[PDB]
């Protein structure tokens, strides 16, 4: 069974429980091992959202438009 | 002509409080740009839209 406690997820296993942390590295496996039609069959997407990909591997950064400076004329940004 | 009525005639201070039109009159037509957005920028002061 699962519990949100803060940012990570814990799960019981049962006579007197077993609590463990659910490893991201973990999780992320087990839904890369998910089936096509078992994406589909839970709101998902084969080409443009599969779940394994809420997980996040590797981080876009927006480019300065999107968090642009201000400068106070030179030495002041 | 006189006027065919007659009116109510007489004195009654009044105050003159702030708030004068060109304290308010305000036009653009293109103008400085916020920076983020790139929309035009707000208040009269600073030429905005």
Partial sequence: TIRKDGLKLVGSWKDEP????LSTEEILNIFKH???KDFTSLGFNEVFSRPEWMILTCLP?????????ISFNESQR | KKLMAQ?????????????????????RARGPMQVLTRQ?????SRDGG
């Fill in chain 1, 34 to 36: 998910i089936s096509v």
């Fill in chain 2, 7 to 27: 009116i109510f005639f007489g004195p009654t201070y009044y105050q003159r409080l702030r708030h004068m039109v060109d304290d308010k009159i305000h036009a």
């Fill in chain 2, 40 to 44: 035009p920028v707000e208040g009269r």
């Fill in chain 1, 61 to 69: 950064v927006p480019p300065p438009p999107v968090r642009p400076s």
């Fill in chain 1, 18 to 21: 077993e609590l463990r942390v």
